[PDB]
Every structure is written in structure tokens, then in C-alpha cells.
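Aim 2 progress. For Malate synthase A, the working sequence is reproduced below.
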Amino acid sequence: ATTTDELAFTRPYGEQEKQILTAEAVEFLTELVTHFTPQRNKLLAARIQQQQDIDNGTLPDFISETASIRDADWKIRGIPADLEDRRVEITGPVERKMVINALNANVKVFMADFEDSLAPDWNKVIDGQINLRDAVNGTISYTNEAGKIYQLKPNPAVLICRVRGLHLPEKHVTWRGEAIPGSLFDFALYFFHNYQALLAKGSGPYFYLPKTQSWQEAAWWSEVFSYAEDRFNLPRGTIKATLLIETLPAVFQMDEILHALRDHIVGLNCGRWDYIFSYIKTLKNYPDRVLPDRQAVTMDKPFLNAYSRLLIKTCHKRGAFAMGGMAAFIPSKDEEHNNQVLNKVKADKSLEANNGHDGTWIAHPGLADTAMAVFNDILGSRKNQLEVMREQDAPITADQLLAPCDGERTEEGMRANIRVAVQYIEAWISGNGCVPIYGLMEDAATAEISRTSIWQWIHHQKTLSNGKPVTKALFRQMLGEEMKVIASELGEERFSQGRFDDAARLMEQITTSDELIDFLTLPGYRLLA
Ligand SMILES: [Ca+2]
Ligand SMILES: [Ca+2]
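Predicted C-alpha cells for this construct:
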């Protein structure tokens, strides 16, 4: 085999690729890939070894050797001015119109997403980079079929780019015959095309990093960032990252993650769906760790509240932000439904603010004013809650973080999981990873917890609360039944115009396999061009 330090490209070099994959951009991307891919692959291999040790009966806990880091005083390098107030952030797709609408929402920050809310078609990743570049440059515009123009308002929200996670390939660009890391593709191009303009306007190249499992993974990101900074003669810490704590292994390494990424990190986030998905994957072989209906596994449950409290305390100890979770409701024409939704949003955001979270997430601009009002009210004149140390809290232990919550495993819950996951998958395979389903803007994590919970119940041969043993055969029976429900809900036209048979097949494949696959996006990505 050759010792090449060059990349190969599988798609035609058309007008879009000519904009984004310029000679200079490709040179830089090549350098990152050859310098950092081997270590990235070693990190993926380390994941396997760590998981095996957990499977083999040793539960995760804090790291003994790094005690001196945790029990020392130190803080992150710093937070730039435009990241000191992040009380509400909106998330969404890198599609052109959606970028404009999000930047125009009444929020502090827009996280443009190449990750869970994107089905990573080549055209969509390339268009996404085009869109974000136009957004940074302030020229982004869109005119719809009806002739209505969309443009940026004055003072749009601060832009942050969420990259694909460490496990994901970008199959259309290869090094030594293997797909390069999507993480490097997404990071390299957003940074390269935008760092100059961002810095010139008083902002900076900002990233969201998903699905981290270890401090060593944080260290690798720090090296990537430092490499990028050095290459363009930027001072250390110019690139700023916010890092989701949304895997079980990561909750035991928050302080080490902050330390490893100290030059660049500005905050951590709580999640729900990815976290409990990870809980099940991590504890997959443990008969005493079966979670009930994921619908009932709410953030106020003891293990999730402990997670929340530990994350806030840890972040504030180090001067980093501690971001709360997602309210993904989509307002409807039903004002009564809307009142109930807004009451729920108010209750949930108030819980987060009262706990000390510096900010929170929404998926739809229609929730901005409500979420903002909760945080405005509780913050008073403060920009954030960095001073809230939670020093009154008792220590938080591994036992507490690992304790499965009370609840029932219900047939209604199982059926709903099937309907939501199938409809999510149908859209994803059709190129849409940000999917309105039953009044919620769903991303891949929802499909993940849905399939993973069912897998868990099958694996450990658990009964539903009505006494029915959960089996592959029961699942398959229910799948067929729920497909008919979906058909009735959507109507014959939409159902026939869709990819529901292909979606049901992928669902069955990922749910009924003996081995619990890590991510549905891996087999799913095979279905994309
Ligand atoms: Ca081993
Ligand atoms: Ca997530």
C-alpha cells in the first residue's frame, strides 16, 4: 500500500465544491486528516476496550489517578465577550432558509448543526458550508416560490457550528482508501472559510462538540484546535468550543474534559436523549440497569438530577458555562395546546434556571420569547450564573449517577417508540434529519433511545407492565401494526409518496439484532448517496 499523505474525492468537482473545496481549503483539510486521523482511530479503538471492561462487570466511577486535578483550583482560559450571555440558544439545520430564520430568532446564539439534526448527504454538507459562509459574511438571503425574500435582521444571533461526532465517516473524502473523520471535515471547512470574517467583526470561530466519551478525546480536540490556530498564526484559545456531556462515560470525566480542553472550552451541556441512550448502551449487559419507558425518564429523576447538579457545580468551579437542555415543541394553530405547551416550557426552564444553568435550548423560534422571559426573570441583571457554585450540595457519587429510575415499561410506550423512530428514520433516509413528529422537532437521538430501549427489554427478557414478555417476535408484530397507524395518520398519498417500507426495515434491523449497535446513523449512512 502507498504511504500517501494526500486525499481522494469521490464526487464530481462541481460549482458548489469549487466554492468550498478550494486548493487552499483542501491543503489545510489534508494536513488535519493526515496529522490527526491515526489518533482519532486509536481513540475509537480505546472506546471498545473501555466498554468491554464495563460489560465484564466493573461499573464506571471517577478516575483515581487524576485526583490532584480535581482537587486543585484552576479555571478555563476565558470566554469571549459575545459568549458571556447565552441564556437561550436555538438549534437547527444548515439549510439556507432555516439558517436565516434561526439567526433572526429572539435568542442569543444559533447552533448550526451538521450532526444529529442533519442527514449528512454530500450536497447537504457542502450547501451547509456555503450557507454558513454567507451567514458569517452577512449576505445570506433566500427567496421562496411565493416571491417572499428572507434576509438577516440587524444584530443577528451569534453563530456556533456543531460538527459530526468522532465515530462518523465522511465517505466522499478518503485518505489511504478509508473515509476521513466527519468531525475533521466539518471543523476544517467552517474554521477555514470563516475565521477571518468572524474575528474581524468581534466574534470568533466557535464550535459545538458532541458525544465525547473521555478526557483523551477532549485532549485530541485541543491538539486539532491548537494546530489550526498555529497554522494561521492565531493566539492560543481563539477557537472556542462548547462540549455536550451526553454519554455516560463522560459524566465521570467532566473536570478532566474541562482541563484537557482548557485553552478552548467555554461550557458543557446537559442532554436527555443522548445521555439515556448512552446509559443503556454503556450498561447494556446489566440486568439490574433496565430503564422504564423513556417517556418517563425525565430530568427530575434522581440520577438525572444528580447529573445536572454535578455538571453545574463542575463547570462553575472552572468558570465555564453549564447549559441546560432542549424544549423542542413546535407551536400549532391550537391556542389551547399552545397554552399547555408554554406552561410546560415555563416549568422546565424555571427548574433549570433555579438549578444554576447559564442558558438553555429551543428548536423553534416560536419558543424564543417564552424561554428568554424565564431566564430574564431569574437572571435579573446578571448575564449568566457563573457565580452559582452549588457549594451546599453534598458530594455526588457514582452510585447516584448510575441508579436506574422508577417507572413502568408499557405497551403504549413501546408502540409510540416504534411510531416515532420509524417516522424519524423515514425522513432521515429521505435526506431530512430534523423532523416534525407529533408537535416535536425530533433529531436522531430520539430514534436512538427508542430503538435502544426496546433492544434492552428484549435482551434482558423483560415483561411489559401488562405481563407480555418483550421478544423480537412481539416487536415485529407491533411494528406491522404501528405501520398501519402511521398510514392512517398521514393518509394514503403521503404514505405512498414516502419511504416507510425502507424505514421499517432499518428499524427492525437495528432493534432485533443480537448485538446492540452503537449508532443507527452508521448503517443508515449506507442508504445515502
Ligand atoms: Ca478487551
Ligand atoms: Ca445530542
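Residues 116, 210, 244, 246, 271, 274, 445 surround calcium ion (ligand 2) (CB under 6 Å). This observation will guide construct design in the next reporting period.
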